[PDB]
Amino acid sequence: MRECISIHVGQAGVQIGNACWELYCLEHGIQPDGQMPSDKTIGGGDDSFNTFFSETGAGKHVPRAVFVDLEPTVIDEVRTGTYRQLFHPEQLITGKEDAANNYARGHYTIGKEIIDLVLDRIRKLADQCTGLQGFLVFHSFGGGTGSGFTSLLMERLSVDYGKKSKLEFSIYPAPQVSTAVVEPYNSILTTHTTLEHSDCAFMVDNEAIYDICRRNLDIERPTYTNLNRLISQIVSSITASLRFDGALNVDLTEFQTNLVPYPRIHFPLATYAPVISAEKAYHEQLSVAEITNACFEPANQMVKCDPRHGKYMACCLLYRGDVVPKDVNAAIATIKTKRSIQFVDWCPTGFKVGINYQPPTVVPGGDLAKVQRAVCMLSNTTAIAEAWARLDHKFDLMYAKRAFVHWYVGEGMEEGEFSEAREDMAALEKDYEEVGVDSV
Amino acid sequence: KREHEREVIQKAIEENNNFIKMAKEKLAQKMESNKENREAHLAAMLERLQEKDKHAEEVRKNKELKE
Amino acid sequence: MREIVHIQAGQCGNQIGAKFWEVISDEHGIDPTGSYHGDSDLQLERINVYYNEATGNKYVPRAILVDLEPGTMDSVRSGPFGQIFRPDNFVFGQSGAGNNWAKGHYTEGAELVDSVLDVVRKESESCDCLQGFQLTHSLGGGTGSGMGTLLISKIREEYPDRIMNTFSVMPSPKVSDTVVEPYNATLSVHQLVENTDETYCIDNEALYDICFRTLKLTTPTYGDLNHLVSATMSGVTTCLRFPGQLNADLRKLAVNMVPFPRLHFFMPGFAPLLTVPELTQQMFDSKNMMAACDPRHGRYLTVAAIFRGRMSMKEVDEQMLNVQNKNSSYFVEWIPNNVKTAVCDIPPRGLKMSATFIGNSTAIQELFKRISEQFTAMFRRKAFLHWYTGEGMDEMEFTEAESNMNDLVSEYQQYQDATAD
Numbered sequence: 011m012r013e014c015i016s017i018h019v020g021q022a023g024v025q026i027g028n029a030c031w032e033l034y035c036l037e038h039g040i041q042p043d044g045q046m047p048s049d050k051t052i053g054g055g056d057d058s059f060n061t062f063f064s065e066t067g068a069g070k071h072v073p074r075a076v077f078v079d080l081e082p083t084v085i086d087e088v089r090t091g092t093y094r095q096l097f098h099p100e101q102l103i104t105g106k107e108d109a110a111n112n113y114a115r116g117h118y119t120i121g122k123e124i125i126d127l128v129l130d131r132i133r134k135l136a137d138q139c140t141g142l143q144g145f146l147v148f149h150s151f152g153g154g155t156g157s158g159f160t161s162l163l164m165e166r167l168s169v170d171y172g173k174k175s176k177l178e179f180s181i182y183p184a185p186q187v188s189t190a191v192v193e194p195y196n197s198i199l200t201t202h203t204t205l206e207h208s209d210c211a212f213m214v215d216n217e218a219i220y221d222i223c224r225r226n227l228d229i230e231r232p233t234y235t236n237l238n239r240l241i242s243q244i245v246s247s248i249t250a251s252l253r254f255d256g257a258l259n260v261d262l263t264e265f266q267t268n269l270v271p272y273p274r275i276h277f278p279l280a281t282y283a284p285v286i287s288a289e290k291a292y293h294e295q296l297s298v299a300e301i302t303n304a305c306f307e308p309a310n311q312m313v314k315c316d317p318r319h320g321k322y323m324a325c326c327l328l329y330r331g332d333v334v335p336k337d338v339n340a341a342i343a344t345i346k347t348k349r350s351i352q353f354v355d356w357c358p359t360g361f362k363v364g365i366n367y368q369p370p371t372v373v374p375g376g377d378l379a380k381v382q383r384a385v386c387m388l389s390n391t392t393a394i395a396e397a398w399a400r401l402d403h404k405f406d407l408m409y410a411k412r413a414f415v416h417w418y419v420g421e422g423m424e425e426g427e428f429s430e431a432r433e434d435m436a437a438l439e440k441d442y443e444e445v446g447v448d449s450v
Numbered sequence: 451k452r453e454h455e456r457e458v459i460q461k462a463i464e465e466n467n468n469f470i471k472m473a474k475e476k477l478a479q480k481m482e483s484n485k486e487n488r489e490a491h492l493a494a495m496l497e498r499l500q501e502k503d504k505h506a507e508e509v510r511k512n513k514e515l516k517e
Numbered sequence: 518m519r520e521i522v523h524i525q526a527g528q529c530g531n532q533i534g535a536k537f538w539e540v541i542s543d544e545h546g547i548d549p550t551g552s553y554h555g556d557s558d559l560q561l562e563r564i565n566v567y568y569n570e571a572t573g574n575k576y577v578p579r580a581i582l583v584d585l586e587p588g589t590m591d592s593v594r595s596g597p598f599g600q601i602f603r604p605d606n607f608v609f610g611q612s613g614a615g616n617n618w619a620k621g622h623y624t625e626g627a628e629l630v631d632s633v634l635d636v637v638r639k640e641s642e643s644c645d646c647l648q649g650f651q652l653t654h655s656l657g658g659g660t661g662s663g664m665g666t667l668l669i670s671k672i673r674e675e676y677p678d679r680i681m682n683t684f685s686v687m688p689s690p691k692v693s694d695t696v697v698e699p700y701n702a703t704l705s706v707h708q709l710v711e712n713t714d715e716t717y718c719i720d721n722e723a724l725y726d727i728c729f730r731t732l733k734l735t736t737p738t739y740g741d742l743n744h745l746v747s748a749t750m751s752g753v754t755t756c757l758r759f760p761g762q763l764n765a766d767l768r769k770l771a772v773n774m775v776p777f778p779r780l781h782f783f784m785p786g787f788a789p790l791l792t793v794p795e796l797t798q799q800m801f802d803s804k805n806m807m808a809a810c811d812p813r814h815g816r817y818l819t820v821a822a823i824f825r826g827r828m829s830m831k832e833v834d835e836q837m838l839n840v841q842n843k844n845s846s847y848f849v850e851w852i853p854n855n856v857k858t859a860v861c862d863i864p865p866r867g868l869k870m871s872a873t874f875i876g877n878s879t880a881i882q883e884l885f886k887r888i889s890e891q892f893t894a895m896f897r898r899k900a901f902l903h904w905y906t907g908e909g910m911d912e913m914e915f916t917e918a919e920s921n922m923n924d925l926v927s928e929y930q931q932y933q934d935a936t937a938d
């Protein structure tokens with residue numbers, strides 16, 4: 011059991027979902043029609059990949075997932091896409107009118123018209139679980155649906171499922187690919203509203219991913235397709251412990267114990283390696299020591315910030331592929347005596363390690379080189395608060411003049427919700443500052 | 451000791467239910483306040499357009515009363 | 518889908534309206550019979566936005582043709598793509614407005630408006646999900662100006678949660694010798710600021726200067742001015758009509774272009790009148806603005822730009838970054854990332870590549886100051902004021918429209934002078 015239900019909200023959530031589930035299928039040897047030859051238990055099973063896939067009597071392996079968007083054109087591409095047979099039609103839910111980059115429309119005006127239907131379809135998935143573990147919610151900060159509807163959903167999920175774990179994969183906005191000027195507003199509102207309802211959230215800075223695609227894969231002008239195929243690798247690394255087995259395999263919940271020292275401090279910094287093109291990877295083997303040291307290069311982070319100017323509260327290394335503890339320990343010992351790694355005084359300095367022997371997979375026609383071993387570092391650093399600081403500043407510039415606020419007020423919201431949301435963020439920045447101060 | 455054990459798990463249940471309860475009410479309050487506001491905004495808009503019709507009637511009336 | 522309902526009122530409205538439908542019908546690859554004869558599927562991806570699909574794959578414009586005189590109606594029906602328009606959507610009176618705003622708004626138009634609304638209602642009720650309306654008209658005349666603003670108020674009554682966009686043609690003595698125009702404009706502006714979500718300020722003063730000084734066309738015809746308007750209207754609706762990163766949504770444009778409800782008057786621009794750096798410098802140049810205003814006499818609140826044709830997207834990003842940096846003083850700092858770029862692979866007709874500009878600049882006040890100046894010159898003498906009171910109007914409604922437009926100017930000035938600190 012230990013099933014996990016994925017919920018993909020808005021364009022970003024959906025399209026990242028397409029990348030993730032395509033990648034999952036290739037890792038598990040599942041076909042586009044849902045058939046899995048290697049799986050001999052037909053109609054069911056308690057294998058590790060069953061945490062993400064249910065099984066029909068006809069041998070089809072179905073993603074434990076719901077796709078939701080208040081506009082049909084993105085999900086329509088799923089309905090007619092390569093993996094259309096993979097999902098039951100009821101798993102793909104669409105309205106007719108999006109949130110127009112407006113949090114209010116996503117949370118209230120438009121969202122309320124579909125929220126009950128969504129919860130019902132989510133319930134149908136959960137009833138098929140023999141031991142539901144929690145939810146994974148994919149969404150953007152900037153979109154009206156990704157922000158507004160997600161926060162509404164998270165609120166409703168806490169009511170219908172109590173304290174059942176809810177994890178986020180959140181797309182932090184970047185001007186190179188941003189779609190709205192009001193994304194800072196939507197970002198602060200969703201973060202405030204969701205904060206009490208999320209147990210752990212992995213932020214993905216689009217600018218960080220944009221730079222990595224340009225720098226490491228030599229893509230002149232990365233598309234969402236370029237970004238999403240990279241994101242899915244990070245997501246895969248994080249969920250690998252749930253979808254596979256192994257002696258040295260460490261469950262994500264165990265890392266979570268270390269990563270969240272206080273409820274509000276639940277935003278881990280992800281760093282992935284190696285990101286390299288086929289051209290450069292040829293006749294070039296990146297060892298355990300090399301990919302591990304790369305985790306402490308800020309240019310490889312999912313969020314733009316400087317951990318070297320902050321303090322660590324946890325450090326987790328999630329390896330996959332040809333990796334053994336001996337080489338890991340050697341690599342860590344070297345890194346500790348050359349890198350700027352400083353912990354807060356209330357936390358032990360030991361790195362927590364997990365290894366999944368299943369090697370990295372790549373999607374056909376992708377840009378990422380197929381390597382024998384990869385690593386994803388999950389750290390809890392005060393430096394992530396820099397991402398809040400940048401967003402909150404852009405929020406302040408516009409709100410001082412009440413720019414664009416009338417679009418929100420027009421949809422039923424009040425300025426009190428803006429000030430309430432911004433104050434919670436200021437408290438959050440203060441929280442990250444306090445945890446870094448030495449004990450008395 | 452057995453008594454303490456009961457009190458702990460009861461407290462856990464109480465806090466969990468209290469969280470669910472407050473979350474349920476806080477949300478119902480927000481959607482209600484939002485429904486009121488949005489309606490009040492659309493109602494005012496129509497009232498201003500309603501005044502434009504009343505004005506136009508007074509204009510057309512003012513014309514024939516100058517002949 | 519997401520349908521837009523087109524409306525064209527008065528002479529000017531129907532002229533540019535007809536031209537708009539000619540140009541995009543070509544781009545979407547449909548003939549004046551309503552049949553598709555294109556090569557790319559991208560032409561029909563978002564065709565439903567402006568067209569109704571009838572029997573036998575017959576694409577009919579979702580357009581409503583209005584005028585208080587039947588003259589222009591025959592011109593459209595006889596002109597190219599006159600056989601594509603829906604016959605029942607032709608709504609015509611018999612008595613013109615005679616360039617009288619009061620007639621169009623209170624008297625003559627108020628009698629014809631209901632039959633128009635019946636056609637609006639019939640079109641709207643057949644939409645999967647109506648997103649709003651777009652109006653083409655002038656503010657200098659009587660019908661398109663007076664009755665156009667009447668329709669807006671009436672449509673907004675039955676569709677208050679829909680977007681109301683307008684392509685308003687501003688009057689200029691350089692083109693029209695009619696004397697009472699600054700009255701009809703001020704009275705129209707008084708309505709547009711209250712009841713429209715997005716207004717594209719098409720300025721004849723600008724259109725004239727472009728044909729004359731840039732295109733080297735002394736004594737420019739309306740066909741010349743409209744060729745500019747058509748290319749402009751085609752550009753600012755490209756993303757509404759073609760597949761892209763961001764889809765066709767009037768509301769999303771309004772949300773990101775309008776920081777304050779009253780300040781929704783855009784000055785469009787077009788280029789050329791090449792390489793990517795050239796296009797970018799031109800489209801931001803004052804000479805290429807369809808509104809007679811210098812952007813360097815104010816600051817940009819927001820800007821939307823559409824490049825069309827096959828070109829380097831890396832280069833477009835770099836050059837757009839370059840302009841914002843080199844001209845940072847002309848963009849308000851209290852709105853981060855207020856310039857957004859879109860790219861359509863399909864170029865217009867005749868050009869290998871072009872660039873359309875949509876700016877929300879505080880420099881637009883120059884246009885409203887021009888009208889206000891010409892207005893107060895007429896109103897101090899009460900010249901031709903009897904043509905308006907004759908229909909039952911009051912001197913106050915002239916005063917209110919004046920001061921309301923004066924407020925709009927000062928409000929644009931307020932946010933031009935505003936600072937981050």
Ligand SMILES: Nc1nc2c(ncn2[C@@H]2O[C@H](COP(=O)(O)OP(=O)(O)OP(=O)(O)O)[C@@H](O)[C@H]2O)c(=O)[nH]1
Nearest residue numbers: 020021022108109111150152153154155156187234
């Ligand atoms: N990484 C990544 N980011 C995306 C993708 N699609 C959209 N985004 C980001 O999401 C933000 C806008 O939110 P969207 O998800 O597109 O909008 P939405 O959730 O559908 O809500 P609506 O406004 O109603 O459309 C922008 O900052 C985009 O950069 C994607 O496929 N991958």
Ligand SMILES: Nc1nc2c(ncn2[C@@H]2O[C@H](COP(=O)(O)OP(=O)(O)OP(=O)(O)O)[C@@H](O)[C@H]2O)c(=O)[nH]1
Nearest residue numbers: 527528529532614615616655657658659660661693
């Ligand atoms: N750019 C452009 N402007 C036009 C065109 N036709 C008329 N105008 C302008 O429109 C203004 C007058 O409004 P019209 O549209 O002609 O008049 P109307 O809307 O039919 O109202 P009435 O004639 O009084 O019934 C003048 O200032 C003209 O310069 C045109 O084809 N192109």
Ligand SMILES: COc1ccc(C=C2c3ccccc3C(=O)c3ccccc32)cc1O
Nearest residue numbers: 189190191756766770773822855857858859
């Ligand atoms: C100023 O900020 C913005 C302004 C406008 C938009 C959206 C749009 C827009 C949105 C929906 C439909 C059409 C358009 C466009 O045709 C357009 C063309 C180029 C760039 C942006 C835009 C998005 C923004 O973030």
Ligand SMILES: [Ca+2]
Nearest residue numbers: 049051054055
């Ligand atoms: Ca099985």
Ligand SMILES: [Mg+2]
Nearest residue numbers: 020021081108
């Ligand atoms: Mg969307």
Ligand SMILES: [Mg+2]
Nearest residue numbers: 528616658659
């Ligand atoms: Mg005329």
